[PDB]
Amino acid sequence: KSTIDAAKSMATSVMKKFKKSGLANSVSTLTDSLSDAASSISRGASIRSVGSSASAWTDVSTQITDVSSSVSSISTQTSTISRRLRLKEMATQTEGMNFDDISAAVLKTKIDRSTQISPNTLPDIVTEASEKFIPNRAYRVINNDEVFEAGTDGRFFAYRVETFDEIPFDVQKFADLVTDSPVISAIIDFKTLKNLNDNYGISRQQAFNLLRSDPRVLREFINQDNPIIRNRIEQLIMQCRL
Amino acid sequence: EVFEAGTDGRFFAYRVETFDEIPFDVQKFADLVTDSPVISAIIDFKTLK
Amino acid sequence: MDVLYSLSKTLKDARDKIVEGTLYSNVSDLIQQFNQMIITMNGNEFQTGGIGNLPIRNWNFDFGLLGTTLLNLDANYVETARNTIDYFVDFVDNVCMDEMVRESQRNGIAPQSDSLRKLSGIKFKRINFDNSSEYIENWNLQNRRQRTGFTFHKPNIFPYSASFTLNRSQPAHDNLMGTMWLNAGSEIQVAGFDYSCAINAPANIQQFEHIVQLRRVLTTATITLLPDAERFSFPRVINSADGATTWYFNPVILRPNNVEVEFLLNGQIINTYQARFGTIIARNFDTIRLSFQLMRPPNMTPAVAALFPNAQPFEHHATVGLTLRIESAVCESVLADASKTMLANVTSVRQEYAIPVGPVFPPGMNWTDLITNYSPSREDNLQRVFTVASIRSMLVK
Amino acid sequence: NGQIINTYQARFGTIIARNFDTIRLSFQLMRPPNMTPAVAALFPNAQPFEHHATVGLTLRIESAVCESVLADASKTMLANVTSVRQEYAIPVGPVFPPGMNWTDLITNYSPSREDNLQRVFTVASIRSMLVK
Amino acid sequence: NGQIINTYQARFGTIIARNFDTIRLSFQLMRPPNMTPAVAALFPNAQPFEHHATVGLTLRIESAVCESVLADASKTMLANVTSVRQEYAIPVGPVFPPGMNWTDLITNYSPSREDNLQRVFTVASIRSMLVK
Amino acid sequence: NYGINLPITGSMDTAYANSTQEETFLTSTLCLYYPTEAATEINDNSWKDTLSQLFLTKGWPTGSVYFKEYTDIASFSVDPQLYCDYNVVLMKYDATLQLDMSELADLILNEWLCNPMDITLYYYQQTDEANKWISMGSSCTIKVCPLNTQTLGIGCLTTDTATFEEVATAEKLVITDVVDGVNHKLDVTTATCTIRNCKKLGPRENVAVIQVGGSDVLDITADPTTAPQTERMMRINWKKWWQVFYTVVDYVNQIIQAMSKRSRSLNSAAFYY
Amino acid sequence: NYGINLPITGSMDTAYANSTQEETFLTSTLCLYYPTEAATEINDNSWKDTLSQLFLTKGWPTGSVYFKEYTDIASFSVDPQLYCDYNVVLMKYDATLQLDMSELADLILNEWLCNPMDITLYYYQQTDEANKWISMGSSCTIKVCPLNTQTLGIGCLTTDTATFEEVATAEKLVITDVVDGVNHKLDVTTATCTIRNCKKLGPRENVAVIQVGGSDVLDITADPTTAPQTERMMRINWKKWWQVFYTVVDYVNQIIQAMSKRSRSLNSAAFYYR
Amino acid sequence: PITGSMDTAYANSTQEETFLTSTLCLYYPTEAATEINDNSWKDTLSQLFLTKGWPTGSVYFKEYTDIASFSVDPQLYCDYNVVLMKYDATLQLDMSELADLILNEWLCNPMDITLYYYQQTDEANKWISMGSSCTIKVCPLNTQTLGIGCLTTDTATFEEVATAEKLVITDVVDGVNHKLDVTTATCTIRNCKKLGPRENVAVIQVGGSDVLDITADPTTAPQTERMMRINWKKWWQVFYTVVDYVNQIIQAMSKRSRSLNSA
Ligand SMILES: [Zn+2]
């Protein structure tokens, strides 16, 4: 409501906030890191390419690796390779409910269910929502029935598109298959999945969808069944707390 | 199973192959509509059968 | 079913009593039984698996008998035997597992799998033998409709329940009175608290009570009862009943006064103990009632007097408690306990083979959910499934 | 081996872990968003912090199966072996830690210690059929 | 057992409930959004509230199957057992409530009461084949 | 209510309906009590207004807050009819008025139940550590005479008040305490005073006496044995009055959270019977 | 459990508990409010006393009943400090003072919640059919000026009160009502008046305004649509004042029964208020 | 992070590293020394300090003559600083503001009152100003850079929150911009963020019934170990006690980790 050319220049101000924040610059970086990759010359502040060859996404992260100490190798790259893999990629191309689409939902929700929202506040708050929503989260890439899961921050696994399974995970096989293929915003991840597959019983049919993070098949359960699924979901809402 | 919400009036239920009128369900309808892809039935039953 | 049993004790008493050396005479009675089997089997054909991630496997039979000739046993004799056993082992495993997954509402007691349904057939009954395995022992006695019974160490009769009840409360939660508890497995801990230390209570005594209703009767129970609930003897910040805020619990413990434990059966007191801590026997009960009081100390040294003022704020919260543990007991119904692997075996086979949730058991064979709504169907299915797990563990662990 | 075999989210009571070599417990302390005065008083915006917020978990393995011999709360094997050695003043050898110390043994449970332990446990069990 | 086996939304008339131990009826009173004067007059914005808005439901189990014996509107078993006991001034026993009171019996339908009831109902049915 | 009987459920669902400050911002009222000197030092015709806009920051809608001016601890003590949902009263210790202050705190910070006393016709008796005589007015002067079990004086003649024992000489608020379980002929100066028999108890889930000055301690206990320190008893370090108010505003919620509404359905809490 | 959290389950034990009047005779107080003219017509120095002995008949112990003298409907309508458990107020029909009477009834017969208003610094607005402005004092004169969504007058200049709209000219009790959801700069004569913002809640389980004379009315609804008639609103046919009191005494219980316990004051409360 | 393994291996002593390696600086007021009236008091106490275990060249004696000057100049010289404060009842707060500074760890930046109107961010962002005569007037700005109860143009409409103090920790409603008007000629005002406390000072208070507030809010009251109190008799007695209990006082403090860029 109200909006005397507020939500207006404000839908514009909400803009004039975005292009000056987390999501902004970051996306503006990956972009260059490609141009500057092929085009000019790879700013070699040390650079690796865990995978076939150089390609911003994989490598530029494979290298850099700033501000994350106290554990094991893999995790650190995975992580730093997550950072762009995630967020950054989303504002581009992918399937099923994409994290943010769970976020937007949070916003268009409260920003209506609220009472304390004058125009001045509209900006920022929206922006800030992006930078601080679903602190972490991971992704996956299927290829020959092999769920490769870059559990951002920490963790990482693999699966048979059929039986699921803690099969060798490799910074390599990972490298490429990530770089240029479609990714998936793993709504529900392993933990919830394996626990789900057992005390329960996921038809090959379903499962195959529960990966692409299909809207339907997911909606079903949460709507129908109600076991676990209703936490992996909910917990996320609770996470987009900002 | 072609579920056809003939707006205003009508509603029919097929069997995607050898077409066939058959019990239409406000229920089975409910959901399968809510969250799945729909289709702007260019040609509908009448013309089709 | 009983059929099944034999198949194993056959193999066990086999893979056990048959070795490079011993005299024939010690197995004569055995050897026979064995062969008898091979015969009845040979010619028949089977099928196991087909559900979830469980492989489908077909089995056929065409085996030679056993040399009832020899005096002693030569190495060669064994190896030619062990080779035949290993096919049956790998068989039974697949048989058990296949019937250890299927559930059924109507008749959740009888066999399910194509594999077993075929066994209950009459033509195979020619194999039963030595039913001393505690579980089968009780499986039979139940068919003939008679008094069964099992043995358990730290039984698992209490569904997990951790909560509180505020008998006196107010928004600030600065002068509460009530109880908090943890019922889980074979143990109960309950504390009664009164922020006012019974300052305005009749006889300066606040009465507390905790009642726990078992889903099945336990007989012959050996129980440890101790004063105090250590679990509720430390400072806590707890969520309010409505979840809208949090309250502070800062306990100071006093001895529970006029402790009375009653083990009731259908509303009748079967056993009652007044302030008796240590080991007590409850011979038959479906309910436990713990009554205890907080009595304001009539005489207090300065340090104590300082904790209990005549007026708020009440900063030290008088608490009395009890701890009760059922070490062992007998139940006419199967239950999970702290020693038997049955529940874990059934749950594990289902998890490993990605068996879909069925119509009888709660997702994941969740114990709390199971015991909370322990219907006749769940019990019949559980017993069938536990008995099969026990048959399997005679050969495969 | 790094793979999640069983996972439980906030499930207290009895749970089954069918095959594992590692247990990982993750839990959080969340500052109460709403606090009565008594609670608010424990958690000021500035130090000194006099009441220390603590969250915890307790996990007990009631029963399990292991492919290797182990000491447990019911079997007398370890105690039998340890007792015979102590009674006869048997000198420390090259395999077992002094006094058959369980913690030391399980901490560095080498193949040699396990093979010797199994041999020694099996003999203790043979002995207990006649002599207790 | 806590699971929805059958659910019906606003369906009046004849419905089938195939297996259940609990019935839950949920319904609402919705203030009429449009009211003629006569209706508007019954529902003022302020007290006194003199006409009390009421919504309701009626549910009747015409027939069903039960694995346990029960009294119903056609069988004379309960009446036979109760009648023989009353006629012969049979003293109250340890199992059945005074007068074979149905409400008391079904309220605390213990295994013992059910086994005794079944035995006693089966005998009543044997008797009614010859003596009515 | 109508309901207390039949206990709540203690199950630890463990959900905590987030916030609580967002309901109080919308639905409650905040009343600030200060002394004249406080406002005089501020010297602005718009201070109440400026602070109000500043109060929107902390989340209180325009028509929400207020400002009530007591000019002395003595006057503020007697005709205190706490006006709003939440009352935070500013007191700047004055060292000679300490007990005046103590008696006033004892009244606001606590929940009181009173009945009227007829000093003229009846000879009465204080019952427990919670039965006190709270008198207040223009000039309260109370003389007492303890009676033995015969209606006879003990160190006094129930006939001549010149033998009575004076326990209050012209105060504006007085909470009198006598040896429990003893009858006393009372002689108050009812012309300028009113004395009522009160039973104590419930505290106040509102006030928040914020103390300015000194090295402040208060002793609600009429006894010697106890000393209660509550959250609704805060203290601020004196610099200037503008600073005091800035802080009160900058920490409104913190101060409100130490109280908590829901306890305020009476004009004045001199509960009448 | 105090937390005004509620549950209760109505099994029909059907223990119809007996009397009710024998708890009120022992534990409660009855306060009779009348006008001066009432007592003046009685002309006895012992009327309060005689009636009191007569009150023992109906079952009220000596020290139980109190007699409060309002001399006018305007003054009585002022501080309203109902003294006793049960208050039955006698109102003599003065036809010119009808609304004065209506405004006073509306206050006693009902449960009110108020906050203070600062006419000086903040222009207010009423929220629902239950948010009213009750002002009272020596001489209450209220002028109002409706504000559009800019803080600008509508038919007035928020600057000169000579353009305001007068809605009360020197009353002793006034319940003002303005178009809901509109801000108003208010101009009361705070010198002699006090105006407070009240939200109407529960009703009163005490008063029992007994009306002498007319044919009668006194409607307490601000709207036109509703007319509520409660039990705590009784009427008596005037003859002589002695007769009125005799009747009030001869039917004390009947009158008390139409009121009873003043629920908002009942001990048993908490989150609901006292 | 440190490994958490517990197996007890007490260090034994602690005080024998501090006796050897650290300095102790005693701050007192002039009146304190004047009452002592000896040309060798600093010396006598020093020999007495060897008893408690502090080598000759170890202990230093700094003379503040007032709480106001000391409050400005707390360029704490030694490893351990124990400051003696005299209960002056009119100066209480001055004392509070000085305690708040020594007892705590502060981070500050400079403020240009002339060109940029500021705002405090959290319960830890305060404006600490100090000098000859500190007089601070403030004017709150609405979201337009316009006054609220003031004209950003005439300081005669500002709100005075400090009239000529020697040390002032000013607090304004968080999240609001303010045009500030300090008397920069004699004052310096800097924007500080609080935090870490001080593992040194040990304000020892002489006299009163010494309880005093050190929080800006009303809700909290923090009582730390580095805040001690002694009963006044004579100054010689005070010092004897400080010496007789040096270690006890030192133990209530103990060497800093601040990686403070100011040094
Ligand atoms: Zn045990």
Curated annotation (Swiss-Prot), chain C:
Which residues does the record give as Zn(2+) binding sites?
153
Q: Where in the cell is it found?
A: Virion
Q: Where are the transmembrane segments?
A: none
Instruction: Return the InterPro entries for the record.
Output: Capsid_hemagglutn, Rotavirus_A/C_VP6, Virus_capsid_a-hlx_vir
One record GO biological process: fusion of virus membrane with host plasma membrane
Give the span(s) annotated as Interaction with the inner capsid protein VP2.
62-73
Q: What is the protein's quaternary organization?
A: Homotrimer. Interacts with the inner capsid protein VP2. Interacts with the outer capsid glycoprotein VP7. Interacts with the outer capsid protein VP5*.
Q: What name does UniProt use for this protein? A: Intermediate capsid protein VP6
Which classification does the entry list for the species? Viruses, Riboviria, Orthornavirae, Duplornaviricota, Resentoviricetes
Curated annotation (Swiss-Prot), chains D, E:
Q: Which domain of life is it from?
A: Viruses
Which compartments is it annotated to reside in? Virion
Sites where the protein binds Ca(2+): 1, 21
PTM text: The N-terminus is blocked. Sumoylated with SUMO1 and SUMO2. Sumoylation of viral proteins seems to have a positive role on viral replication.
Subunit info? Answer: Homotrimer. Interacts with the inner capsid protein VP2. Interacts with the outer capsid glycoprotein VP7. Interacts with the outer capsid protein VP5*.
Question: Additional info?
Answer: The VP6 trimer contains a zinc ion located at the center of the molecule. The zinc ion is not essential for either trimerization or transcription activity of the DLP. Zinc-depleted VP6 has an increased sensitivity to proteases.
| Family recorded in the similarity comment | Belongs to the rotavirus VP6 family.
Q: Give a short account of what the protein does.
A: Intermediate capsid protein that self assembles to form an icosahedral capsid with a T=13 symmetry, which consists of 230 trimers of VP6, with channels at each of its five-fold vertices. This capsid constitutes the middle concentric layer of the viral mature particle. The innermost VP2 capsid and the intermediate VP6 capsid remain intact following cell entry to protect the dsRNA from degradation and to prevent unfavorable antiviral responses in the host cell during all the replication cycle of the virus.
Q: What is this protein called?
A: Intermediate capsid protein VP6
Organism (species):
Rotavirus A (strain RVA/Monkey/United States/RRV/1975/G3P5B[3]) (RV-A)
Query: What residues of the intact protein does this structure contain?
Result: 266 to 397 of 397
From Swiss-Prot, chain G:
At which residues is glycosylation annotated?
A: 18
Asked whether the UniProt record includes Disulfide bond among its keywords, one would answer yes
For this chain, the Swiss-Prot or TrEMBL PTM comment says:
N-glycosylated.
Compartments (UniProt record): Virion; Host endoplasmic reticulum lumen
Q: Sorted alphabetically, which keywords does the UniProt record give?
A: Calcium, Capsid protein, Disulfide bond, Glycoprotein, Host endoplasmic reticulum, Host-virus interaction, Metal-binding, Outer capsid protein, Signal, T=13 icosahedral capsid protein, Virion
- Main localisation: virion
Q: Which GO terms describe its cellular component?
A: host cell endoplasmic reticulum lumen; T=13 icosahedral viral capsid; viral outer capsid
Where is Ca(2+) 1 bound in this sequence?
Answer: 44, 155, 163, 165
Where do the record's region annotations for GPR motif lie? 202-204
Query: MF terms per GO, please?
Result: metal ion binding
Q: Where is this region: LVD motif?
A: 186-188
Region (CNP motif) location: 114-116
Q: Has keyword Disulfide bond? A: yes
Q: What do we know about how this protein assembles, alone or with others?
A: Homotrimer; disulfide-linked. 2 Ca(2+) ions bound at each subunit interface in the trimer hold the trimer together. Interacts with the intermediate capsid protein VP6. Interacts with the outer capsid protein VP5*. Interacts with host integrin heterodimer ITGAV/ITGB3.
Family membership = Belongs to the rotavirus VP7 family.
Further details from the record:
Some rotavirus strains are neuraminidase-sensitive and require sialic acid to attach to the cell surface. Some rotavirus strains are integrin-dependent. Some rotavirus strains depend on ganglioside for their entry into the host cell. Hsp70 also seems to be involved in the entry of some strains.
User: What does this chain do?
Assistant: Calcium-binding protein that interacts with rotavirus cell receptors once the initial attachment by VP4 has been achieved. Rotavirus attachment and entry into the host cell probably involves multiple sequential contacts between the outer capsid proteins VP4 and VP7, and the cell receptors. Following entry into the host cell, low intracellular or intravesicular Ca(2+) concentration probably causes the calcium-stabilized VP7 trimers to dissociate from the virion. This step is probably necessary for the membrane-disrupting entry step and the release of VP4, which is locked onto the virion by VP7.
Put simply, this protein is called Outer capsid glycoprotein VP7
